[PDB]
Amino acid sequence: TPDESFLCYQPDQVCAFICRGAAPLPSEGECNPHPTAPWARVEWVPTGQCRTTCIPYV
Amino acid sequence: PDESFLCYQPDQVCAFICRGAAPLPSEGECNPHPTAPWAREGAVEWVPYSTGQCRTTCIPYV
Amino acid sequence: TPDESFLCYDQVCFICRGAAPLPEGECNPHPTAPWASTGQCRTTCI
Amino acid sequence: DESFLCYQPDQVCAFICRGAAPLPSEGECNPHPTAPWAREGAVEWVPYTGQCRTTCIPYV
Amino acid sequence: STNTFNYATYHTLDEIYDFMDLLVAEHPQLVSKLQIGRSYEGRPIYVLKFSTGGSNRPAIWIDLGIHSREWITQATGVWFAKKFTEDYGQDPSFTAILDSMDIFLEIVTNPDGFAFTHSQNRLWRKTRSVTSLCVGVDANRNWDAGFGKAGASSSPCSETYHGKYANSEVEVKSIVDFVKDHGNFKAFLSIHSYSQLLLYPYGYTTQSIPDKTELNQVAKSAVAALKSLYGTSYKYGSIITTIYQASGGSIDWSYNQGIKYSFTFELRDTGRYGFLLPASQIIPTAQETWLGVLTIMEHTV
Amino acid sequence: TNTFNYATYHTLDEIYDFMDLLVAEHPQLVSKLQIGRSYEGRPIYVLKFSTGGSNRPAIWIDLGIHSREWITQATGVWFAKKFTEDYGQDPSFTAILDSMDIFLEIVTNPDGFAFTHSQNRLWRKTRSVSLCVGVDANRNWDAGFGKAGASSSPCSETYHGKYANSEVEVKSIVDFVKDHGNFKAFLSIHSYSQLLLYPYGYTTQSIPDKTELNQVAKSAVAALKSLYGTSYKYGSIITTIYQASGGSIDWSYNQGIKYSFTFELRDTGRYGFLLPASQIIPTAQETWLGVLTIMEHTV
Ligand SMILES: [Zn+2]
Ligand SMILES: [Zn+2]
């Protein structure tokens, strides 16, 4: 039911996930439960579903 | 393994019994806590929760 | 806009999104009653 | 765990036994899974070649 | 008046029969009294019919006091009868039910046994037939459903004596003939005490009924509704798994006739007072059981 | 008090007038003690039931610490009358009152109670102040004060206040009980859940008297159940409801008052706090049986 927020680190971006009945896959980086990133606050995509937005590193 | 929690919210207490999950931060101040009769009786229905499942039930402060 | 729960006191009845139950009886914010003579409403705003 | 319902003229007695079975004096005894009342009631093991815990109800 | 009637005490057969007449006189367009037969000793056997029209509408059968010592059942029957007349046109669920279905309430299924519990032996269970050192038959072992099988006695002296043949007891035969002649019963509820159980078939066999999932779901709901009132715990399941094997029982019979919603209630308590449940618990027992009975009726409609 | 309607919920003025009537009718048995003034200046009243002695071993009973729990204040009103009806008639209760004093506080939280009649029927806390008003008077006692099962947030229902005994409604009782110094039983009456509880709420640590209080609870519950079949469970607060730090009976027990129990009256959540007036007498009657059982074991 409820939404769980995650923050992921990848070498080239930071991604925020809000998931319902799911969590980010290992391929989506070092992802850990964390408050929704301030810039993350639309499209649910996929055991459940996650919406996600990223910002790049340079 | 089944783990149980009492989550203390401003207006109510909610019991959680969980498999492969733990109550989310949105559930309030959650303590690992043996299941009480009211919890055992009311928390019947498993629902998908995080990457596992929980059964939950609440009471107001009495 | 999150859900706000109320308890109104013939019967006892509310979960609302951006509104509150009107004097629907003697209503006060209260956790959602467990069941949601002398019956029981399960109502919903807006 | 070996369990029985023993049907007597006035009551039914449940037996959960280890290393024993209800004696002929317990009436018409049928191998039978335990009902909730039998689990609620049959709490104390007693010597009986082994031991049994037992509880009865009148016909209801 | 049924308004000044004391529902918080146990009554004699005459008082209950007089109550039936009062309630009919007060609600003649809702309730009628039917004599479906005479007991072994010649007492009229009465059913209250609750109806708002139609001809032989889908019906709910409720029997109480088949075992005479289970005094909480007859007392609950009296309360139920009054409740039906109090709630019709006030409660929308119960009005809906009665607007499409009839209810047949047999408050005292075993009138000789009941008279005997007041006159001679408070803890008498059986009918009073002598078909006489060892009087009577267990009316809930006399039905033509696994008759004679385990869970009934071939001994006249035992409390589960099945009798010489199925339907030998006029008290049972009367219900059988009534329900069969009617042909349109949708639910069939037998009310007993005690244990705090809600039971579905079978008692005579470990074989699962084809409607196990549904009846188990209905029992689960009715028990939740019952419990919601005063916090009384009930258990539910087939007769054979939840109390004991019982052959020739009413709901096994009713179910095999095709009456799907066939249930047996075991009311309060779990043995402290047993059959001698105090009068002060009549009303609370009837009130909470009503919620469970209503739940089943809603599922029927 | 014979013409008084016990099957109806009363305002605070009705209950306070009732107390004066009862004292007038029974001057040698009951006296009205004022133990303090509430945050909003309302008198805090305790009914003393006594047949004499000086500093006799005492039973404390408090109701309506949480204002919305109306069954409790109503039960306390019925209890008061019952005590005067049964003294010199019931041999067991007569024996109790010939050896012991009973202190009954019917409305432990009068400001909240006033609020539940005028503004919010479901108010729980005191009315002390802060936009966010009031302290949970049953989180304000000096017994694991501030520990888990109380909130440090003023806006939350279990707000423990700035410090233990910060609430005059709690300090008034603490002062009184400690000054007296000879209380043997301490009973706090709440609703709802149908529970009889013993310490502790603040810690999973068992009390030294667990076995006995458990036996006392068992008898009380059986006695209560016999009237209407009202099903109670029993056990420690923390294992049977939830963790609750700074509670009254944890405090009393730590003062050495062995027979410290909390009742959660009817129901189990159907009407909850909004228990209909029709259940007032039935509740009071069965609860009395439980309470008298504890009193009998106390003597
Ligand atoms: Zn409380
Ligand atoms: Zn029976």
PDB file of N, CA and C in Angstrom, chain F residues 1 17-33 46-49 84:
ATOM      1  N   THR F   1     -30.336  11.807  45.701  1.00  0.00           N
ATOM      2  CA  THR F   1     -29.563  10.863  44.889  1.00  0.00           C
ATOM      3  C   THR F   1     -30.370   9.612  44.533  1.00  0.00           C
ATOM      4  N   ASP F  17     -22.741  18.724  42.067  1.00  0.00           N
ATOM      5  CA  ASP F  17     -23.963  18.838  42.878  1.00  0.00           C
ATOM      6  C   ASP F  17     -24.317  17.484  43.498  1.00  0.00           C
ATOM      7  N   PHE F  18     -24.291  16.432  42.671  1.00  0.00           N
ATOM      8  CA  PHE F  18     -24.510  15.059  43.131  1.00  0.00           C
ATOM      9  C   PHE F  18     -23.694  14.730  44.374  1.00  0.00           C
ATOM     10  N   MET F  19     -22.415  15.098  44.360  1.00  0.00           N
ATOM     11  CA  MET F  19     -21.504  14.846  45.476  1.00  0.00           C
ATOM     12  C   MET F  19     -21.949  15.532  46.764  1.00  0.00           C
ATOM     13  N   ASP F  20     -22.519  16.734  46.638  1.00  0.00           N
ATOM     14  CA  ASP F  20     -23.023  17.488  47.793  1.00  0.00           C
ATOM     15  C   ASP F  20     -24.272  16.834  48.363  1.00  0.00           C
ATOM     16  N   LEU F  21     -25.163  16.397  47.467  1.00  0.00           N
ATOM     17  CA  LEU F  21     -26.356  15.621  47.824  1.00  0.00           C
ATOM     18  C   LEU F  21     -25.973  14.369  48.601  1.00  0.00           C
ATOM     19  N   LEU F  22     -25.017  13.605  48.073  1.00  0.00           N
ATOM     20  CA  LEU F  22     -24.579  12.373  48.725  1.00  0.00           C
ATOM     21  C   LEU F  22     -23.963  12.612  50.101  1.00  0.00           C
ATOM     22  N   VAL F  23     -23.176  13.682  50.242  1.00  0.00           N
ATOM     23  CA  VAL F  23     -22.602  14.058  51.546  1.00  0.00           C
ATOM     24  C   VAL F  23     -23.699  14.462  52.539  1.00  0.00           C
ATOM     25  N   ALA F  24     -24.690  15.215  52.054  1.00  0.00           N
ATOM     26  CA  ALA F  24     -25.832  15.640  52.866  1.00  0.00           C
ATOM     27  C   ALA F  24     -26.606  14.438  53.423  1.00  0.00           C
ATOM     28  N   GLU F  25     -26.848  13.448  52.563  1.00  0.00           N
ATOM     29  CA  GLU F  25     -27.608  12.249  52.908  1.00  0.00           C
ATOM     30  C   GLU F  25     -26.829  11.279  53.787  1.00  0.00           C
ATOM     31  N   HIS F  26     -25.506  11.254  53.631  1.00  0.00           N
ATOM     32  CA  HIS F  26     -24.658  10.306  54.358  1.00  0.00           C
ATOM     33  C   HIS F  26     -23.476  10.968  55.069  1.00  0.00           C
ATOM     34  N   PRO F  27     -23.763  11.883  56.017  1.00  0.00           N
ATOM     35  CA  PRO F  27     -22.698  12.691  56.613  1.00  0.00           C
ATOM     36  C   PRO F  27     -21.684  11.902  57.438  1.00  0.00           C
ATOM     37  N   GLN F  28     -22.106  10.783  58.022  1.00  0.00           N
ATOM     38  CA  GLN F  28     -21.209   9.989  58.871  1.00  0.00           C
ATOM     39  C   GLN F  28     -20.363   8.996  58.053  1.00  0.00           C
ATOM     40  N   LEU F  29     -20.722   8.808  56.781  1.00  0.00           N
ATOM     41  CA  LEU F  29     -20.008   7.882  55.894  1.00  0.00           C
ATOM     42  C   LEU F  29     -19.134   8.585  54.841  1.00  0.00           C
ATOM     43  N   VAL F  30     -19.701   9.568  54.149  1.00  0.00           N
ATOM     44  CA  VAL F  30     -18.982  10.251  53.069  1.00  0.00           C
ATOM     45  C   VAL F  30     -18.738  11.755  53.305  1.00  0.00           C
ATOM     46  N   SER F  31     -17.506  12.180  53.027  1.00  0.00           N
ATOM     47  CA  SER F  31     -17.122  13.586  53.066  1.00  0.00           C
ATOM     48  C   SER F  31     -16.483  13.990  51.737  1.00  0.00           C
ATOM     49  N   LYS F  32     -16.655  15.256  51.361  1.00  0.00           N
ATOM     50  CA  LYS F  32     -16.121  15.772  50.101  1.00  0.00           C
ATOM     51  C   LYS F  32     -14.849  16.577  50.343  1.00  0.00           C
ATOM     52  N   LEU F  33     -13.719  16.018  49.916  1.00  0.00           N
ATOM     53  CA  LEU F  33     -12.414  16.656  50.066  1.00  0.00           C
ATOM     54  C   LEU F  33     -12.004  17.370  48.772  1.00  0.00           C
ATOM     55  N   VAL F  46     -12.379  14.800  45.755  1.00  0.00           N
ATOM     56  CA  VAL F  46     -12.270  13.392  46.125  1.00  0.00           C
ATOM     57  C   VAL F  46     -13.361  13.084  47.152  1.00  0.00           C
ATOM     58  N   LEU F  47     -14.105  12.000  46.934  1.00  0.00           N
ATOM     59  CA  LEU F  47     -15.059  11.527  47.938  1.00  0.00           C
ATOM     60  C   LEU F  47     -14.397  10.546  48.905  1.00  0.00           C
ATOM     61  N   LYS F  48     -14.446  10.878  50.194  1.00  0.00           N
ATOM     62  CA  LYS F  48     -13.902  10.010  51.232  1.00  0.00           C
ATOM     63  C   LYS F  48     -15.039   9.175  51.805  1.00  0.00           C
ATOM     64  N   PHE F  49     -14.885   7.853  51.777  1.00  0.00           N
ATOM     65  CA  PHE F  49     -15.839   6.931  52.393  1.00  0.00           C
ATOM     66  C   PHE F  49     -15.138   6.290  53.574  1.00  0.00           C
ATOM     67  N   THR F  84     -22.814   3.788  49.340  1.00  0.00           N
ATOM     68  CA  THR F  84     -23.750   4.191  50.388  1.00  0.00           C
ATOM     69  C   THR F  84     -24.950   3.242  50.495  1.00  0.00           C
TER      70      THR F  84
END
